[PDB]
C-alpha cells in the first residue's frame, strides 16, 4: 500500500478534490481511447486495433500522473485554495495534452513501426515533417512535461510551506523536501530539451536529435544533475 | 498432589487455571513446574525419585521414555478417543501402545515486523 | 514567517480582543533570537524593533513568564516563545497548538541560543561516586529519560537510542530547525557578566530609561 | 451483500482506485450507448431503438467485469503499484474493446435477427465476411477475453503473494487460491479458441465454427478442465 512506513498519510479519506481529480483523470484515459470512431465495418475494426499501442503508451503516461498525484493527496491531504489552484493547473495541462499525446504516440508508433519492420504505412498523413514542425513538437510536448512536473514540485512546496500546520515530523520533512527535488530533477530534462530547441544551435535536425536524446538519457542525466548538487 | 512438568516457553499459568478448576470439582492441588532442561532431567529423576505426575513436551522424546519404561500405557475410552484427530494419535504410539495424549501441532514460523519490513524475504 | 509582519497581525487580533505574541521579555534568553537575527548593527536593528513593539503598545512592558504562559495557555494570545519544557503545560490546557520556525527579520532568520541541558557534580560533596551511578545507569538511559520527558519535555536528548522517537516528534523538528539556524552558547566564565549586561540592557530599553545606542555602549564594556 | 461469510472484506471503504475504476467503468457502458448519434427525426429514433439489444448484450458483459472487480477490491482492498499496474491494464483492455464489442454485438444481433425471423436487414454494411476477417474476429475478441480474465488471475495472485501482509486466514486463502484457478479456467477457453484459430487446421470455416462452439460449451468445458486437475 504505502511507499514510506515512517510517513503518516493524512489524506487517507477520499476528498472532493481527490474524487473530482479521479473523474478528470478517468476521462483522460477514457476519452483518449473512446474519442475514436465506432468501427462500423471489419475494415474499421482492424484499423482501430492499430491504435491500441498509441493509447497503451499514452494511458501508461496518464496513470503515472495520477499515481504521483494519488500519493501527494494521500500524503498531505491538502484542500486549500493554493492546492486547488495548482491541482486545477496540473489537470488543465494533462487535458490540453490528452489528444496531442494521442497524436504523438500515433506518430511515434508509425516511426517505430517501420524500424522494427512490422508496418510500412505512410507518414504523409501526419503532415510535412519539417525542422520547424519537429522543433515545435519538442517545445510543445517538452513544455507539457516540464509543466506537469513543475506543478507537482509546487504542490509539494505548498506542503513544506505548511509543514508546521500539517504536523510534519522529521521523517516527513525529508520526504517533502526530497519530493520537491525529485519533481524538479524530473522537470529539469523537459526544460533542457525545450531550451535547447528554442535556442536552436545547429539550425538543422542535429538540434531535434539532441533534444530527443535527453529523454532516453533521463536516468543517467538525473544522476548527473544530482551528483553536482551533492559534490558542491 | 498433582504435579505437572511443562516447558517455561509454554502457557504454565493458563494450564494452572485448568488445575485451579480441577481442585474445585475434586480437591486435588495442581501445582505446575517449569524446570530448565526438563527433557533430560525427567528420565533421571522419574526413574530413581518421584518426578512429575504427567509430562508435556513434543512427541519426539516420548519413544525414549517408553523403551526405558518411564511411561504408563494410555487406555483412552472411544467416546474421548473420537474427540481428537486420528493421525494425531499415530504420533504418540510406540510398539502398538499409546504412550501419550496429543495436545497440539507446532512448527517454526517466520515472525516478521510489518512496520520495519512490509514484504519480507 | 517574518517579525516585521507581527505588528500588522496584532492590529487584526486586537480588533477581536486578543494579543499577537507574549513572551518572557524580562529574561534575555527569549529576546536574543530577534536581537541576534542579523548580527554592532544587527543588535541595534534587532533590539530597536523590539522596543518599537512595546512603544506601539503591541507588547506589555513587564511581560514575565507566568503571564506570557498563562495568556497563551488560556487562549488570550495567538503566539508565545518557549522551549520544549513548556509544551506539557499547553497539553494540559485544551489548546490546539503548533510549534514552528521562529519569525525571520531583515531576511536573515532569528538566531536563538541553543542550550545543552547538562548535569555536573559539585566539588564540596561526599556523595561523588553515588551521584555518578545515578546519572549514567539510572537517568541517561532509555527508561530514565522517558520518565523526565513525559513529565516536562527536554528537547533533543543526547542519547543515541532516542533518535527514532525524536525524529517521530514534529516539535523536535521545529526546535532543531531553530537550533541549526541559531548557535550553541560558549561555556566560558564571562557568560554570567555577559548575560547580566544583556538582561539589564533589555530591561532599561523596555521600561524606557536607556537608548538603544547607549545600551550596546554600556553592554560592550 | 457478501459472497463468503468466512471472508473478512478489507476494502469495505471506497478507495481512489475503486472510485477511479468506477468512473472508467461508467464511461464504458455510458459512452458505448451514448457514442451514438442524436435521433434528429422519427426515422433515426426507430433506428437507434434497434441498437438497444447490442448494448443490452455488451453492458451485461461490462457489469460482470465491474462485478468481478468490485468483489476483488472489496475482498483485499489492495492499492499498490502492482494492483494499480494490473488494474490499469484490466480497464485499458475493457476500453479498447468497448466499441469493438458494440460492433460485434451489432453484427451478432443482425445474424441472430435473421435466424429467429425478426429482421432481414443486409450484412454488407459490416463488410466482406471472409475467412480471414472471421478468424481475426475470433482471435481479436478471444484475446480481449483471455486478457481481462488473465489480469483478474494476476490481481488475485498479487493478493496470494501478500497473503501474510493482508492477514489472510485459512478460509481466505482457499478463496484467493480458488479465485485464481476460477479466473484461469475462465481465461483457458478464450485462450483455446484464440489458439485453434491462429493455428487454423481446416483452412476454412470449420476452424471458425469450432472456435465459436467453445463459448457455448463454457460450463461443460470448465468442468472437463477442472476434472483433469482433480483426477490427476
Ligand atoms: C507499431 C504498430 C502500430 C502503429 C499504429 C499507428 C496508429 O496510427 C493511427 O491509426 C489509426 C487507425 O485507427 C488512424 O485512425 C483513424 O481511424 C480511427 C478508427 O477508429 C479513427 O478513430 C481516427 O479518428 C482516425 O484518425 C490514425 O489516423 C493513425 O494516426
Ligand atoms: C435482433 C434485432 C436487433 C438487430 C440490431 C442490429 C443493430 O445494427 C446497428 O443498427 C444501428 C441502428 O441504429 C446502425 O447504427 C447507425 O445509426 C445510429 C443512429 O443512432 C448511429 O448511432 C450509428 O453510429 C450508425 O452506425 C448500425 O450501423 C448497425 O450496425
Ligand atoms: O535569560 C538569560 C539566561 O538564559 C539561559 O537560561 C535559560 C535556560 O537555558 C533554560 O533552561 C530556561 O529555563 O530558561 C532560561 C532563561 O529564562 C542561560 O542558560 C542562562 O545562563 C542565562 O542567564
Ligand atoms: Cs463526439
User: Coil, strand or helix: which one is B45?
Assistant: helix
Do C10 and C68 touch, CB atoms closer than 8 A? no
Helix (H) or strand (E) holding B54: strand B54-56
User: Coil, strand or helix: which one is A230?
Assistant: helix
Greatest Cα pair distance in chain A: 63
Interface A–C counts its CB contacts (< 8 A) at: 30
CB-neighbour burial class of residue A19 (10 A; exposed 0-12, middle 13-18, buried 19+): middle
CA-to-CA distance for C121 and D185, rounded, in angstroms? 79
Contact A56 D92 (CB under 8 A): yes
Q: Which residue reads 454488407 in cell numbers? A: D124
| CA A138 vs CA A51, B46, D105: distances in Å | 22, 89, 42
Comparing CA positions, the residue from D6, D151, D15 lying closest to residue D74 is D15
Do A190 and A143 touch, CB atoms closer than 8 A? yes
User: Which of D82, D164, D167, D168 is the best mutation test for B, with the most CBs of B within 10 A?
Assistant: D164
Comparing CA positions, the residue from D187, D210, D183, D214 lying closest to residue D199 is D210
C99 Cβ neighbours under 8 A, 6+ residues apart: A164, C87, C170, C171, C174, C175
CA B80 to chain centre: 17
Half-sphere exposure for D48 (CA within 13 Å, toward CB): 14
Helix (H) or strand (E) holding B56: strand B54-56
Do D51 and D116 touch, CB atoms closer than 8 A? no
CA-to-CA distance for D127 and D134, rounded, in angstroms? 11
Closest residue of chain C to A162, computed from CA coordinates = C100
User: Coil, strand or helix: which one is B5?
Assistant: strand
The method recorded for this entry reads X-ray
Do B92 and B99 touch, CB atoms closer than 8 A? yes
Angle ∠(D94,D97,D99) on CA atoms, nearest 5: 120
For helices A170-199 and A131-161, the axis angle rounded to 10 degrees is 160
Q: Concatenated DSSP letters for chain D?
A: --S-SSS--S--SPPHHHHHHHHHHHHHHHHHHHTSPP--SHHHHHHHTTTHHHHHHHHHHHHHHHHHHHHHHHHT---SHHHHHHHHHHHHHHHHHHHHHHHHHHHHHHHHHHHHTS----STTS----HHHHHHHHHHHHHHHHHHHHHHHHHHHHHHHTHHHHT--HHHHHHHHHHHHHHHHHHHHHHHHHHHHHH-SSSSHHHHHHHHHHHHSSHHHHHHHHHHHHH-
Encode burial over C123-145: b for 16+ CB neighbours within 10 A, e otherwise. eeeeeeeeeeeeeeeeeeeeebb
Contact A169 C100 (CB under 8 A): no
CA-to-CA distance for D59 and C152, rounded, in angstroms? 64
Residues in chain D: 232
SS (H, E, C) chain C: CEHHHHHHHHHHHHCCCCEEECCCCCCHHHHHHHHCCCCCHHHHHHHHHHHHHHHCCCCCCCCCHHHHHHHHHHCCEEECCCCHHHHHHHHHCCCCCCCCCCCECCCCCCCCEECCCCCCCCCCCCCHHHHHHHHHHHHCCHHHHHHHHCCCCCCCCCCCCCHHHHHHCHHHHHHHHHHHHCEECCCCCCHHHHHHHHHHHHHHHHHCCCCHHHHHHHHHC
Sheet of strand B32-33: strand arrangement: B32-33, B4-6, B54-56
The residue whose CA has the least distance to atom 12 of ligand 2 is D47
Do C198 and C28 touch, CB atoms closer than 8 A? yes
User: Which of A21, A38, A51 is the best mutation test for D, with the most CBs of D within 10 A?
Assistant: A38
Do A38 and D99 touch, CB atoms closer than 8 A? yes
User: Which of A169, A171, A175, A177 is the best mutation test for C, with the most CBs of C within 10 A?
Assistant: A169
| CA C101 vs CA A179, C49, C172, C182, D224: distances in Å | 21, 19, 11, 11, 71
Bridging pattern class, strands C183-184 and C113-114: parallel
The cell numbers describing C27, all together, are: 529574561
Do A212 and A193 touch, CB atoms closer than 8 A? yes
Give the number of other Cβ atoms within 10 Å of residue A16's Cβ.
Answer: 9
Residues in chain A: 232
| CA B13 vs CA A50, B18, B51, C111: distances in Å | 72, 9, 20, 59
Q: Which ligand is nearest to the CA of D98?
A: 1
Do B7 and B57 touch, CB atoms closer than 8 A? yes
E strand spans, A114-173: none
Give me the phi and psi of B32, to 5 degrees please: -125, 115
For helices C212-220 and C41-55, the axis angle rounded to 10 degrees is 130
User: Coil, strand or helix: which one is B100?
Assistant: coil
| CA A130 vs CA A136, A139, A141, A149, A203: distances in Å | 10, 14, 17, 29, 12
DSSP state, residue B98: B
Which residue among D106, D114, D117 is best mutated to probe the pocket of ligand 2, counting the most ligand atoms within 8 A of its Cβ? D106
Contact A2 B116 (CB under 8 A): no
Closest residue of chain C to A7, computed from CA coordinates = C168
User: Quick check: A159 contacting C, CB < 8 Å?
Assistant: no
A128 Cβ neighbours under 8 A, 6+ residues apart: none
Q: How far is A114 from chain C (nearest CA, A)?
A: 56
Do D170 and D8 touch, CB atoms closer than 8 A? no
CA-to-CA distance for D193 and D135, rounded, in angstroms? 10
Closest residue of chain D to A59, computed from CA coordinates = D92
Comparing CA positions, the residue from D184, D193, D230, D231 lying closest to residue D215 is D193
Comparing CA positions, the residue from C188, C186, C221, C194 lying closest to residue C113 is C186
Q: How far is C66 from chain A (nearest CA, A)?
A: 26
Q: D50: Cβ below 6 Å to ligand 2?
A: yes
The residues in D 19-38 lying below 8 A from A, measured between CB atoms, are 19-20, 23-24, 27-28, 31, 35
Half-sphere exposure for A28 (CA within 13 Å, toward CB): 29
Query: CA gyration radius for chain D?
Result: 20
The cell numbers describing D228, all together, are: 483433469
For helices D170-199 and D205-216, the axis angle rounded to 10 degrees is 160
Nearest beta carbon to residue A170 from set C99, C101, C172: C172
Encode burial over D64-91: b for 16+ CB neighbours within 10 A, e otherwise. ebbebbbbbbbbbbbbbeebbbbbbbbb
Helix residue spans in B1-121 (DSSP H)? 12-25, 38-48, 62-68, 78-81, 86-90
CA-to-CA distance for A103 and A109, rounded, in angstroms? 10
Atom number in ligand 3 closest to CA C24: 17
User: Coil, strand or helix: which one is B6?
Assistant: strand
Do B113 and B119 touch, CB atoms closer than 8 A? no
C126 Cβ neighbours under 8 A, 6+ residues apart: none
Give me the phi and psi of C100, to 5 degrees please: -135, 180
Do C21 and C6 touch, CB atoms closer than 8 A? yes
Q: Which ligand is nearest to the CA of A40?
A: 2
CA-to-CA distance for D126 and D147, rounded, in angstroms? 25
CA-to-CA distance for A10 and A24, rounded, in angstroms? 23
CB-neighbour burial class of residue A73 (10 A; exposed 0-12, middle 13-18, buried 19+): buried
Contact A170 C174 (CB under 8 A): no
Comparing CA positions, the residue from B36, B20, B38 lying closest to residue B28 is B20
CA-to-CA distance for D172 and A58, rounded, in angstroms? 37
Give the number of other Cβ atoms within 10 Å of residue D155's Cβ.
Answer: 25
The cell numbers describing C53, all together, are: 513593539
Taking contacts as CB-CB distances below 8 angstroms, the residues of chain A near B118 are: 2, 5
User: Coil, strand or helix: which one is A228?
Assistant: helix
| CA A144 vs CA A88, A92, A138, A191, D18: distances in Å | 14, 10, 10, 10, 28
Question: What resolution in Å is listed for this PDB structure?
Answer: 3.8
Do D212 and D153 touch, CB atoms closer than 8 A? no
CB-neighbour burial class of residue A79 (10 A; exposed 0-12, middle 13-18, buried 19+): middle
Helix (H) or strand (E) holding B53: none
Give the number of other Cβ atoms within 10 Å of residue D118's Cβ.
Answer: 11
Q: Does domain C1-113+196-220 have CATH number 3.40.190.10?
A: yes
Half-sphere exposure for D88 (CA within 13 Å, toward CB): 24
The residues in A 73-112 lying below 8 A from D, measured between CB atoms, are 74
Q: What is the dihedral of CA A76, A79, A84, A90, to 10 degrees?
A: 30
Contact B116 A5 (CB under 8 A): yes
CA-to-CA distance for D184 and D176, rounded, in angstroms? 12
Taking contacts as CB-CB distances below 8 angstroms, the residues of chain A near D19 are: 14, 18-19, 22
Q: Which ligand is nearest to the CA of A56?
A: 1
Q: How far is A172 from chain B (nearest CA, A)?
A: 16
DSSP state, residue B93: B
Interface B–D counts its CB contacts (< 8 A) at: 6
Do C76 and C18 touch, CB atoms closer than 8 A? yes
Amino acid at each position: 500500500v504505502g511507499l514510506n512506513p515512517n510517513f503518516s498519510f493524512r489524506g487517507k479519506q477520499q476528498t472532493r478534490i481527490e474524487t473530482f481529480s479521479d473523474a478528470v483523470f478517468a476521462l483522460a484515459i477514457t476519452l483518449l481511447v473512446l474519442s475514436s470512431t465506432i468501427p462500423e465495418t471489419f475494415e474499421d475494426l482492424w484499423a482501430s486495433m492499430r491504435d491500441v499501442i498509441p493509447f497503451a503508451i499514452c494511458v501508461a503516461l496518464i496513470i503515472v500522473i495520477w499515481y504521483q498525484h494519488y500519493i501527494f493527496f494521500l500524503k498531505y491531504g491538502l484542500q486549500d485554495k493554493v492546492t486547488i489552484l495548482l491541482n486545477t493547473i496540473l489537470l488543465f495541462v494533462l487535458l490540453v495534452y490528452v489528444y496531442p499525446l494521442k497524436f504523438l504516440a500515433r506518430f511515434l508508433s508509425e516511426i517505430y513501426g517501420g524500424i522494427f519492420g512490422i508496418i510500412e504505412t505512410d507518414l504523409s498523413r501526419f503532415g510535412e515533417y519539417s525542422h520547424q514542425n519537429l522543433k515545435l513538437l519538442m517545445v510543445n510536448y517538452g513544455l507539457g512535461a516540464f509543466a506537469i512536473f513543475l506543478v507537482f514540485s509546487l504542490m509539494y512546496w505548498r506542503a513544506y510551506k505548511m509543514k508546521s500546520l500539517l504536523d510534519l515530523n522529521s521523517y516527513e520533512i525529508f520526504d517533502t523536501k526530497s519530493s520537491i527535488i525529485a519533481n524538479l530533477l524530473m522537470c529539469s530534462v523537459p526544460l533542457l530539451s525545450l531550451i535547447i530547441t528554442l535556442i536552436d544551435p545547429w539550425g538543422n535536425f542535429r538540434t531535434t536529435i539532441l533534444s530527443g536524446f535527453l529523454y532516453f538519457l533521463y536516468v543517467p542525466i538525473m544522476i548527473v544533475f544530482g551528483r553536482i548538487t551533492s559534490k558542491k | 498432589k498433582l504435579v505437572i512438568w511443562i516447558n517455561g516457553d509454554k502457557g504454565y499459568n493458563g494450564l494452572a487455571e485448568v488445575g485451579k478448576k480441577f481442585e474445585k470439582d475434586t480437591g486435588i492441588k495442581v501445582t505446575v513446574e517449569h524446570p530448565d532442561k526438563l527433557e533430560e532431567k525427567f528420565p533421571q529423576v522419574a526413574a530413581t525419585g518421584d518426578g512429575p505426575d504427567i509430562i508435556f513436551w513434543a512427541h519426539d522424546r516420548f519413544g525414549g521414555y517408553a523403551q526405558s519404561g518411564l511411561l504408563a500405557e494410555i487406555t483412552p475410552d472411544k467416546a474421548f478417543q473420537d474427540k481428537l484427530y486420528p493421525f494425531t494419535w499415530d504420533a504418540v504410539r510406540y510398539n502398538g501402545k499409546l504412550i501419550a495424549y496429543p495436545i497440539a501441532v507446532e512448527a517454526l514460523s517466520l515472525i516478521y515486523n510489518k512496520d520495519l519490513l512490509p514484504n519480507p524475504p | 514567517k517574518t517579525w516585521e509582519e507581527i505588528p500588522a497581525l496584532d492590529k487584526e487580533l486586537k480588533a477581536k480582543g486578543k494579543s499577537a505574541l507574549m513572551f518572557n521579555l524580562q529574561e534575555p534568553y527569549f529576546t536574543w533570537p530577534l536581537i541576534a537575527a542579523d548580527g554592532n548593527a544587527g543588535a541595534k536593528a534587532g533590539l530597536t524593533f523590539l522596543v518599537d513593539l512595546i512603544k506601539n503598545k503591541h507588547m506589555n512592558a513587564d511581560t514575565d513568564y507566568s503571564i506570557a504562559e498563562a495568556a497563551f495557555n488560556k487562549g488570550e494570545t495567538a503566539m508565545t516563545i518557549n522551549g520544549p519544557w513548556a509544551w506539557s503545560n499547553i497539553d494540559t490546557s485544551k489548546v490546539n497548538y503548533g510549534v514552528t520556525v521562529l519569525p525571520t527579520f531583515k531576511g536573515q532568520p532569528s538566531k536563538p541560543f541553543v542550550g545543552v541541558l547538562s548535569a555536573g557534580i559539585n566539588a564540596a560533596s561526599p556523595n561523588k561516586e553515588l551521584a555518578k551511578e545515578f546519572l549514567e545507569n539510572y537517568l541517561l538511559t532509555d527508561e530514565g529519560l522517558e520518565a523526565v520527558n513525559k513529565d516536562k519535555p527536554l528537547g533533543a536528548v543526547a542519547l543515541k537510542s532516542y533518535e527514532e522517537e525524536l525524529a517521530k516528534d514534529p516539535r523536535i523538528a521545529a526546535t532543531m530547525e531553530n537550533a541549526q539556524k541559531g548557535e550553541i552558547m560558549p561555556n566560558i566564565p564571562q557568560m554570567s557578566a555577559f548575560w547580566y549586561a544583556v538582561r539589564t540592557a533589555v530591561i532599561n530599553a523596555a521600561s524606557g530609561r536607556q537608548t538603544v545606542d547607549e545600551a550596546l555602549k554600556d553592554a560592550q564594556t
